[PDB]
Structure 1
Amino acid sequence: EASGPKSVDFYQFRVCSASITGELFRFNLEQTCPDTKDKYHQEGILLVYKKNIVPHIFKVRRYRKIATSVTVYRGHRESAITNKYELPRPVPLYEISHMDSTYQCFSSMKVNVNGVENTFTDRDDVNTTVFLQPVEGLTDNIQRYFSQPVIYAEPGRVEATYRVRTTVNCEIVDMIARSAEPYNYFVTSLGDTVEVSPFCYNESSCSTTPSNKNGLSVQVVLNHTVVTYSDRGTSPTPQNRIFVETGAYTLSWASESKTTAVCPLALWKTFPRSIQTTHEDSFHFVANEITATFTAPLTPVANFTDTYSCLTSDINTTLNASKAKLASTHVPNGTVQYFHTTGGLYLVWQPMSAINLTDNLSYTQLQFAYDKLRDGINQVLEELSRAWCREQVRDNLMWYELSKINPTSVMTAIYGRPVSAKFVGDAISVTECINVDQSSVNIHKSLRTNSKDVCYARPLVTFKFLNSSNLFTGQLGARNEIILTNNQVETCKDTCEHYFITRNETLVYKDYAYLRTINTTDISTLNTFIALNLSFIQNIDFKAIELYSSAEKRLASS
């Protein structure tokens, strides 16, 4: 019979009506797609905790001994001729400053010098007692106490060279001291600076009963029992205290432990409603009250949050208050957890389940905006996909309905390669197609057959079965296809017009016979397209903007 290569494109004349049954195909009349289930999200109370920066504040008492002399008797009687060194000295502990601590009196006429011990006073006893008194000042936190505040005698009489009048003074000053986070040194309000740790001699090292230091003393007293009330003596508890003897003054302050006094964690904000969304390797806590999102590693890095013993007595109260407020429509679902974000902030998470009726913080806002946009885009894509699936199902149903007329057209539409088909029972049977000798083609110039009013609907063709020596007569179909049975006939009509398509050339029949071959493109080609004039997203550039120039910053000064 006829054999050869199988057709793969609509460019070579081919004929195929073989009765050999091929593959069997059926239309999938049942098709559907489901709807995704909503992914529920956990919620609960979220608390943040920024790093504290407020310095530690405590009160400190200072003692200082002042000795001054005036020598103004130049000529007959001069005034303010010259002044002495006025060197101040630390208060000695000969009486352990017990009288000063009593805030009642003190021993004047201090004796101390680098060369030899010499007593300086107003010509009185070496260990005379002078009653202290408070002096008012232009300060609400410096209750200075003065003894012998008036200037020296300064006789100003007729003296040859100068006078020798001099007095001594005892000074008790109350001030406030502040220390940084490391708590290794602190500076008082007056201005003095000392390089010792405020926390010592109480659950801390670098302090002992003997007095010894590099330029200091660092002496600790057990149950000092400071009266601490010069205006009205009282009976306070003998609290512990320490002393530091500098080169010119002595400072005293109560001893306290580093723990249970100051720890670096302060509450910033509380969000009664928050959403936690898991991810590949991190969490996401949403706080829409300030439009920010905090990310933390999946593992609860704060596995030992019991070291921060301070907050164990306040985070409980805040959580209790928040859950009491939210108890109307929410209940706890699990144990509390502590996380640690990359920015240095600590998060406290307490998941809650609904009850059935029956300055570097810009990246958080950026993350929030990105998450919102991504969620919106994903939801839109999901809806579009569902609509497309429904449309595809309907389209397939139409296709099946259309296939009931001629399966060959539908099969050639679905598969790019031309094929052939027939409705075996209720099942399409697909067979391949076979070409013929392209050179051996002959088309009659007249479609008018014998008799009358029975003219052929399509021109008759003759060809050879490829690699064979034989001739057959067929009728030209469509897309360069040959049909063995020539049953296409029609009644003759006056001024009949006909056109045919054959690859890049066309045939024209103004009458029952014509060969006005013209180009295929000469006839207009209609289009059925719904253009999608989509507009892409332009890409822009961002520029840094500074509110205040460097000139204004310099002009700010201090």
Structure 2
Amino acid sequence: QQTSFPFRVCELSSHGDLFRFSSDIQCPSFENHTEGLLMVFKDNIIPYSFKVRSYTKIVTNILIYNGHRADSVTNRHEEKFSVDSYETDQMDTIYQCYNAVKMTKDGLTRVYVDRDGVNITVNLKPTGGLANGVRRYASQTELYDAPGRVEATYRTRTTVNCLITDMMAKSNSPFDFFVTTTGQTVEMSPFYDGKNKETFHERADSFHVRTNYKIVDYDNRGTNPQGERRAFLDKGTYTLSWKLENRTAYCPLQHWQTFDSTIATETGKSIHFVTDEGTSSFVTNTTVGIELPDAFKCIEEQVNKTMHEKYEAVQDRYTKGQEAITYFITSGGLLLAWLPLTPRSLKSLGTLNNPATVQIQFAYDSLRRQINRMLGDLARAWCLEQKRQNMVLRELTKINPTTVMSSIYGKAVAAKRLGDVISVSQCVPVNQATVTLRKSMRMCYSRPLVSFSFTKTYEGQLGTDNEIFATSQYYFQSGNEIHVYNDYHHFKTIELDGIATLQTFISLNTSLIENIDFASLELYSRDEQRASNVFDLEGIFREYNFQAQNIAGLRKDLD
């Protein structure tokens, strides 16, 4: 950086060395982006959801006592049975069933019938229900509970009701079971039939499927509809049916975002798909490795309907680069569908839930493209400055080659100029101890005389930089101080720091980037999320169970 010029004696070039001025500067200089159509999908988390019908006969017995002043109902007992096919299907079409219910236990037969009367046919009429909840049809909305006519006696009254409920059920992959709106569980895939690989944990022979099945809504009661494939299941206390869709009904991933104009920018490791609209950028570990998906075929349709709309609605300035679409997988588990456009002449994928990554990736990807393009101009514009700083030197040498030389080099040197060529040598510094100045200057010497040694003495003349070889006021430099000379005769000697020094240095007051400790914030804490339900799962159960145990303590004493 900084450079000492000892008092150097330099009346010596033995054509040391020589360099030329490059007739001209040789300016050293210092990414490939294809527009395309981006479309990203994510893992889908909404469980597969479908309509289910359930059927069931409810049998209630009330024990009713006929006292002398009033009556007491002393017990009520309600049991719910399944419904056989012969009558599931009067229910599905005409909406009639029987008011009776049969079974066999150890060979003996048990039977229940409405009002302890006879087994007849009845209609299921609609009943009321929740704003927007399951819909039911029942056959006896009245409970049979009339005191026998003899005072001081118990009579037991039977009532039977056929109940159909329409509601929906949900199942999650890999489809081991499903659950109906009202809380019922079924241990099997909604997609299972005889012989399917689909999962099945129910009785082997409580399941069966009907073909060209005729279900009708209560409002097309007695209409002949199209016919469908229906599953039927017996669960002891009810029967369940639903329509038998293939497993293709359900789709693993779902469409997240679709990006009109996006630039795919290639690198070593990966490819960055930056989109300006989504203000985000998807990176994939691919290096050109375009895939084709297998068990995600569920997407083809929409994936290629949308590409068609995009393409067509921009079709004029652009042509297709790949004839087909290709597939990429994000590190965060997103799935990219992409086809690039060139100009015309002039199982699960395991999505992480961190939407921030792709936008950070975009801040930084963006501030990169912008800093780097301004750095390129620093280059060009700065290169021009050198191209002329060069020439200028070529000139300045012609004045005095030496200084100009020392300067560029960065050390005490000396040189002569031999035409189109400059010849630099090296100097050898004289005694810093013995270096002495002389008073006189006698025509006159524009430069003072001085004498010095190395072991005997010599006599010489002072150059600028402390080099050595009417009304007259001049000033001169020496080792660590200046000299005042009136009329070619010495006057006084001021120090290097006495005479004011002029700075010419354009300050580049560029200040550097701060540290900033980024604050940790959240929109919603966990408690806030927990407290966000109306159903106190814990409250409702813990008190339920507490009360329960209290009544159970009544069954006995506690010493």
- Using the size of structure 2 for normalisation, the TM-score is 0.83
Match of 1:490 in 2: none
Decide which of 367, 373, 384 is 1:379's aligned counterpart. Answer: 373
Decide which of 292, 304, 313 is 1:325's aligned counterpart. Answer: 313
Higher strand share: 2
Q: Secondary structure at the match of 1:523?
A: coil
Decide which of 199, 208, 211 is 1:223's aligned counterpart. Answer: 211
Decide which of 126, 129, 133 is 1:138's aligned counterpart. Answer: 129
Instruction: Report matched runs for 1:3-14 at 5 Å.
Output: 9-14=4-9
CA–CA distance in structure 2, aligned partners of residues 555 and 296 of structure 1: 39
Q: Secondary structure at the match of 2:83?
A: coil
Q: Secondary structure at the match of 1:162?
A: strand
Q: AA paired with 1:523?
A: I
Higher helix share: 2
Instruction: Report matched runs for 1:239-258 at 5 Å.
Output: 239-258=228-247
CA–CA distance in structure 2, aligned partners of residues 481 and 223 of structure 1: 114
For residues 480-501 of structure 1, the C-alpha deviation after alignment (integer angstroms, 9 at most, x for no partner) is 3333xxxxxxxxx35x334332
User: Is it true that 1:53 corresponds to 2:45 in the alignment?
Assistant: yes
Match of 1:446 in 2: 440
CA–CA distance in structure 2, aligned partners of residues 165 and 458 of structure 1: 141
User: Is it true that 1:352 corresponds to 2:341 in the alignment?
Assistant: yes
Decide which of 418, 423, 429 is 1:424's aligned counterpart. Answer: 418
Instruction: Report matched runs for 1:257-336 at 5 Å.
Output: 257-258=246-247, 260-299=248-287, 303-334=291-322, 335-336=324-325
Displacement of 1:223 in angstroms is 2.5
User: Is it true that 1:22 corresponds to 2:16 in the alignment?
Assistant: yes
Match of 2:362 in 1: 368
Question: Could you say if the C-alpha distance between residues 34 and 144 of structure 1 is closer, same or farther in structure 2, counting changes exceeding 3 Å?
Answer: same
Decide which of 194, 197, 205 is 2:186's aligned counterpart. Answer: 194
Question: Could you say if the C-alpha distance between residues 550 and 340 of structure 1 is closer, same or farther in structure 2, counting changes exceeding 3 Å?
Answer: closer
Q: AA paired with 1:533?
A: N
Question: Could you say if the C-alpha distance between residues 440 and 370 of structure 1 is closer, same or farther in structure 2, counting changes exceeding 3 Å?
Answer: closer
User: Is it true that 1:522 corresponds to 2:498 in the alignment?
Assistant: yes
Q: AA paired with 2:310?
A: S
Match of 1:497 in 2: 473
Decide which of 394, 398, 401 is 1:400's aligned counterpart. Answer: 394
Displacement of 1:143 in angstroms is 4.6
Q: AA paired with 1:527?
A: Q
Displacement of 1:378 in angstroms is 1.3
CA–CA distance in structure 1, aligned partners of residues 400 and 61 of structure 2: 130
Displacement of 1:274 in angstroms is 0.6
Q: AA paired with 1:192?
A: Q
User: Is it true that 1:343 corresponds to 2:343 in the alignment?
Assistant: no
Indicate if the aligned counterparts of 2:281 and 2:359 stay in contact, CA closer than 8 A: yes
Match of 1:67 in 2: 59
CA–CA distance in structure 1, aligned partners of residues 432 and 239 of structure 2: 119
Displacement of 1:275 in angstroms is 0.7
Structure 2: which 5+ runs fail to align?
A: 347-352, 535-559
CA–CA distance in structure 2, aligned partners of residues 86 and 441 of structure 1: 126
For residues 296-339 of structure 1, the C-alpha deviation after alignment (integer angstroms, 9 at most, x for no partner) is 11256773414212222221111111111111322211232111
Q: AA paired with 1:427?
A: V
Displacement of 1:196 in angstroms is 2.2
CA–CA distance in structure 2, aligned partners of residues 175 and 442 of structure 1: 114
CA–CA distance in structure 1, aligned partners of residues 318 and 276 of structure 2: 19
Displacement of 1:25 in angstroms is 1.9
Indicate if the aligned counterparts of 1:70 and 1:80 stay in contact, CA closer than 8 A: no
Q: Secondary structure at the match of 2:422?
A: strand
Question: Could you say if the C-alpha distance between residues 217 and 472 of structure 1 is closer, same or farther in structure 2, counting changes exceeding 3 Å?
Answer: same
Which structure has the bigger radius of gyration?
Answer: 1
For residues 146-186 of structure 1, the C-alpha deviation after alignment (integer angstroms, 9 at most, x for no partner) is 33444327264234412243233322222222222332222
Question: Could you say if the C-alpha distance between residues 70 and 16 of structure 1 is closer, same or farther in structure 2, counting changes exceeding 3 Å?
Answer: same
- Identity, in percent, stands at 40
CA–CA distance in structure 1, aligned partners of residues 284 and 199 of structure 2: 42
Indicate if the aligned counterparts of 1:333 and 1:351 stay in contact, CA closer than 8 A: yes
Indicate if the aligned counterparts of 1:72 and 1:78 stay in contact, CA closer than 8 A: no
User: Is it true that 1:117 corresponds to 2:104 in the alignment?
Assistant: no
Decide which of 51, 61, 82 is 1:90's aligned counterpart. Answer: 82
Displacement of 1:540 in angstroms is 2.1
CA–CA distance in structure 2, aligned partners of residues 302 and 117 of structure 1: 69
Displacement of 1:361 in angstroms is 0.9
Structure 1: which 5+ runs fail to align?
A: 1-7, 449-453, 484-492
Q: AA paired with 1:408?
A: T
Question: Could you say if the C-alpha distance between residues 55 and 550 of structure 1 is closer, same or farther in structure 2, counting changes exceeding 3 Å?
Answer: closer
Displacement of 1:100 in angstroms is 4.1
Match of 1:233 in 2: 222
Q: AA paired with 2:7?
A: Q
Question: Could you say if the C-alpha distance between residues 236 and 299 of structure 1 is closer, same or farther in structure 2, counting changes exceeding 3 Å?
Answer: farther
Indicate if the aligned counterparts of 1:501 and 1:507 stay in contact, CA closer than 8 A: yes
Match of 2:466 in 1: 480
Displacement of 1:129 in angstroms is 3.8
Match of 1:173 in 2: 165
Question: Could you say if the C-alpha distance between residues 274 and 72 of structure 1 is closer, same or farther in structure 2, counting changes exceeding 3 Å?
Answer: same
CA–CA distance in structure 2, aligned partners of residues 536 and 442 of structure 1: 49
Indicate if the aligned counterparts of 2:138 and 2:163 stay in contact, CA closer than 8 A: yes
Indicate if the aligned counterparts of 1:45 and 1:349 stay in contact, CA closer than 8 A: yes
Instruction: Report matched runs for 1:148-187 at 5 Å.
Output: 148-152=140-144, 154=146, 156-187=148-179
Indicate if the aligned counterparts of 2:7 and 2:468 stay in contact, CA closer than 8 A: no
Count residues in correspondence. 521
Question: Could you say if the C-alpha distance between residues 455 and 329 of structure 1 is closer, same or farther in structure 2, counting changes exceeding 3 Å?
Answer: closer
Q: Secondary structure at the match of 1:410?
A: helix
Q: CA RMSD in A?
A: 3.2
Displacement of 1:47 in angstroms is 0.7
Q: Secondary structure at the match of 1:309?
A: coil
Indicate if the aligned counterparts of 1:441 and 1:463 stay in contact, CA closer than 8 A: yes
Match of 1:4 in 2: none
